[PDB]
Amino acid sequence: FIKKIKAKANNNEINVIIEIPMNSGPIKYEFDKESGALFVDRFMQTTMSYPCNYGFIPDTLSNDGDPVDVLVVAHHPVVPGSVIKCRAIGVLMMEDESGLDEKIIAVPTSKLDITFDHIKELDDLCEMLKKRIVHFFEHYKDLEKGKWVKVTGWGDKVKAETLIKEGIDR
Amino acid sequence: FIKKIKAKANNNEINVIIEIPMNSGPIKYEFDKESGALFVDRFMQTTMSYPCNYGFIPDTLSNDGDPVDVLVVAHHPVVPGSVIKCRAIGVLMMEDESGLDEKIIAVPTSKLDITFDHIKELDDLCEMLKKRIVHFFEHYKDLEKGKWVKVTGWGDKVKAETLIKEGIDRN
Amino acid sequence: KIKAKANNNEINVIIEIPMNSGPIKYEFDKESGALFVDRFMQTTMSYPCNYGFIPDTLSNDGDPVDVLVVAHHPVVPGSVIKCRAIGVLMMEDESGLDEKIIAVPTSKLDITFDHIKELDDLCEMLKKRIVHFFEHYKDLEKGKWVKVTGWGDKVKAETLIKEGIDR
Amino acid sequence: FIKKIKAKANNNEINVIIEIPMNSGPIKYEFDKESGALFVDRFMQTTMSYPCNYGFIPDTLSNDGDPVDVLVVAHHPVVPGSVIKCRAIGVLMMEDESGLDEKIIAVPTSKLDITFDHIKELDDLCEMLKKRIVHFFEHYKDLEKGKWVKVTGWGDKVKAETLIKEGIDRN
Amino acid sequence: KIKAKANNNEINVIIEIPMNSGPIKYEFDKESGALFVDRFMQTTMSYPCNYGFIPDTLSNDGDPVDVLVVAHHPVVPGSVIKCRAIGVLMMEDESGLDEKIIAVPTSKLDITFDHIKELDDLCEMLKKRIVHFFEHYKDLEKGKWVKVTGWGDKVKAETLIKEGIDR
Amino acid sequence: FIKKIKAKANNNEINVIIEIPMNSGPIKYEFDKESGALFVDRFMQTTMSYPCNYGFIPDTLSNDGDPVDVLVVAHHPVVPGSVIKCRAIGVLMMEDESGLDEKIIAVPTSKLDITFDHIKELDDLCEMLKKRIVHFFEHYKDLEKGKWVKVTGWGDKVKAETLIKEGIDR
Ligand SMILES: [Cl-]
Ligand SMILES: [Cl-]
Ligand SMILES: [Cl-]
Ligand SMILES: [Cl-]
Ligand SMILES: [Cl-]
Ligand SMILES: [Cl-]
Ligand SMILES: [Cl-]
Ligand SMILES: [Cl-]
Ligand SMILES: [Cl-]
Ligand SMILES: [Cl-]
Ligand SMILES: [Cl-]
Ligand SMILES: [Cl-]
Ligand SMILES: [Cl-]
Ligand SMILES: [Cl-]
Ligand SMILES: [Cl-]
Ligand SMILES: [Cl-]
Ligand SMILES: [Cl-]
Ligand SMILES: [Cl-]
Ligand SMILES: [Cl-]
Numbered sequence A, F: 001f002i003k004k005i006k007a008k009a010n011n012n013e014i015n016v017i018i019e020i021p022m023n024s025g026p027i028k029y030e031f032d033k034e035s036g037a038l039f040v041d042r043f044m045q046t047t048m049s050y051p052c053n054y055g056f057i058p059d060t061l062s063n064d065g066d067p068v069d070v071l072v073v074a075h076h077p078v079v080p081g082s083v084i085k086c087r088a089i090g091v092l093m094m095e096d097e098s099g100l101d102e103k104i105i106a107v108p109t110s111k112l113d114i115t116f117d118h119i120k121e122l123d124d125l126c127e128m129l130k131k132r133i134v135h136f137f138e139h140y141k142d143l144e145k146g147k148w149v150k151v152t153g154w155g156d157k158v159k160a161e162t163l164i165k166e167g168i169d170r
Numbered sequence B, D: 001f002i003k004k005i006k007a008k009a010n011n012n013e014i015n016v017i018i019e020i021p022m023n024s025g026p027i028k029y030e031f032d033k034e035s036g037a038l039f040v041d042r043f044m045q046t047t048m049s050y051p052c053n054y055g056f057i058p059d060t061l062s063n064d065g066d067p068v069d070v071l072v073v074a075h076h077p078v079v080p081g082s083v084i085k086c087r088a089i090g091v092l093m094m095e096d097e098s099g100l101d102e103k104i105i106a107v108p109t110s111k112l113d114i115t116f117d118h119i120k121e122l123d124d125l126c127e128m129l130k131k132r133i134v135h136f137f138e139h140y141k142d143l144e145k146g147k148w149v150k151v152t153g154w155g156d157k158v159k160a161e162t163l164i165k166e167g168i169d170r171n
Numbered sequence C, E: 001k002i003k004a005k006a007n008n009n010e011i012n013v014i015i016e017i018p019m020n021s022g023p024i025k026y027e028f029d030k031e032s033g034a035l036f037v038d039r040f041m042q043t044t045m046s047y048p049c050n051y052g053f054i055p056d057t058l059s060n061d062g063d064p065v066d067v068l069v070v071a072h073h074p075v076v077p078g079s080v081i082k083c084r085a086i087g088v089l090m091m092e093d094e095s096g097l098d099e100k101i102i103a104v105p106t107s108k109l110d111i112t113f114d115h116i117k118e119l120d121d122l123c124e125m126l127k128k129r130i131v132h133f134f135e136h137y138k139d140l141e142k143g144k145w146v147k148v149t150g151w152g153d154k155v156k157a158e159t160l161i162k163e164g165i166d167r
């Protein structure tokens, strides 16, 4: 199914296949590219869990050979393997032990969740929500030897849009 | 997998691909027929959640080209995308903003849940469950602009079987 | 599509029934790749382990080699755990004889299982719960029963897996 | 609060203080009568959970001095320590390591859940629920050293009402 | 034993029914202090907010002043949320007037609610869901109904609370 | 009920009233000893939740005026307000913004959970559990202005028992 979902349904939206639902315990899942199966990547050893629904845009390629990764801000978790129709609003800038690490910040389209309609940019998101996202990524690998993540900042909507465009065209 | 499952395993059962589990919060899921992926359709704005497991019968086309939809009465939710083996016992009749809408009422086979063995028709279901199904569909689109639902009535098992048969034939 | 083994020290296990997940028994259908509800269990019992099978395997029952993955947390149905076999559980039932592989996540998935090399490393009460589950879970199912006969060691598990892969 | 609740609100009702919710994992709770605190009794070692909401009737004393205990057949779990208004429909008769053991079977009053209104006797409950209640109690102490339970049979409504009345009179 | 107010800008709210917690309605019994099951609700609906009451208060119904606490998470029945009122929901039931205070946790419990000072600060879909719930949660209960007639401001709420304490 | 439960049932046992169940989301509860009610202390803003069942020994008085606090290592969460019968095996030593901060480390007695019979000292707990507990306390207040926690080390069973005895006798 992953090879036949489009990256974008229209000009304004992106399709994001969820791998890890918000607040759903210690399991990190990842889709295997060459089989389409959902693999357990890790039983996490902290008490932490994802601050948003996490997944990727199908039919995309980042610089690292992986699809473009997305954090979908939502009011509720969604099952792994399900697709949320979203719009990009910004990007989370990070660095891990192997270099640059960017995630798109997206919200569901208004036909899925009208309460996000007024959310157009990162500045419209709750400060504590953003602090919590930062805290999660800066700390979720603290007990994992060899691996770390540092947040460097945020990028705007235009940056999110160009990165997704670059991932579709690459 | 949707394009690989028969509508009926035998004369007396239907396969029902589940989209929305019973009593499982505000998420409304739907299979996209082109990709075969399960899409989030809506984060529902009411406090309501589905009174039965909800899905469709593969390899059927209803009147309007959509697969035949099913309410699987059960005691427990199942995973979205899992398939329940069922038998039809009736149909729920409604009207929505785009016209006539009908949903089959079904129960698992006795091989799956023996406790449903003696439920042969709608009248075998308790009154309050039927009332809750009606009240759900009448009200779950109350906060959704442009979209409404009104329940017309019920039809028996023979009406369900004819509806399923015409779905398989149309497919 | 998915290998039975990623390397010599590992098995891939597709989960059908998560540990401690209520009454639903699931089973993957080969031809469709769909997850079918097998039954709604009539007892108050749940699986004591994540339960599934090794892809690309075939045992004498005509089914793939099935596996009880000992774990600290449930995993969603249809997800794949990277594992290693440590033992086998031996059973008899109404259909003949039955064997389930006892596996644990690789140390890449869950470092806390690194010290678990054999069945003797599993805690006693876990093994008793496992035995108790299989001996009683079909109690309210007419015409079906299970009886646990014993355990098999690591090499026995590897042999059963090798044989499953060849067949 | 245990000390401030009547056994019976009216002639056809019992107040039931819940210790263990149905289907709520491996925790077995019990009210300490001296402190009024809810203690953890056991982290159960089987995979089993309670088939009904389980508790006792305040201001009753069974033949062995314990309060009269009750299985409350309901469609949903209730928080530990909460009180459900019920009517008795029967008794489950058992034998344990200490000796004779009896649990009243009750359902919520119609004011709390109208769907229980037509359940008057034990034969009105479905066969598989009764078999599951029996199966639970016969096996839940299987992994517990020195403790066992054996079901000896069921008693009707009149039997439950007598047992409750003797319970109040003994208190 | 619990005060109605910790200070001038705060009310203590004992929770009876947590938000999004299924069909059970609970009510505290004053004499025993026990949490009674009031109803197994027959709809698929659940409470849109944490629902409880201000201890040491008396309304016209003979009950304490009740309160819908806007929160991001459920809290256990019997626990106490430190709150502040921002408004009132005005309703009419089969027995007369039905008023309920709209409260938010204090900034010491949840800083994200600091900017919510009046009902206009609450998002409108939430307010629509609140109204929807109260207008339909008694639909399957014979002889009982509710009509929402409007909202009242913070001053209206503080007056209602002060009277409840005085009474 | 709080003022009716004993601190210790026998020589080998402590009674611990649970305020916060392990892995049970953002809600941080605390008993008000003046009223006996369970208050919400905080809606936590991180993705973290308690790694143990957390509560106190009733009828105890610490140096700081509060009951002796306990982290009960257990295999499952327990409802708030319920009492677990435990034995102390050690102490978590910490400092917060207002000074010394010790928590007892306990396990259920063998009559409640036999799988803890062999755990007699902190060395018997697995390393990752202890790393997770340390990590929780060092970070759970990161998003809370003016409050912090530093872990200084661990004390043995004797230190635990002395602290408990001091709390009962104070
Ligand atoms: Cl980790
Ligand atoms: Cl949009
Ligand atoms: Cl975090
Ligand atoms: Cl875009
Ligand atoms: Cl909606
Ligand atoms: Cl059948
Ligand atoms: Cl409804
Ligand atoms: Cl069964
Ligand atoms: Cl390994
Ligand atoms: Cl078991
Ligand atoms: Cl046990
Ligand atoms: Cl009644
Ligand atoms: Cl059972
Ligand atoms: Cl109702
Ligand atoms: Cl405030
Ligand atoms: Cl609603
Ligand atoms: Cl916080
Ligand atoms: Cl002990
Ligand atoms: Cl942590």
Ligand SMILES: [Cl-]
Pocket (backbone or CB within 6 Å): F011, F012, F013, F014, F088, F160, F161, F164
């Ligand atoms: Cl001690």
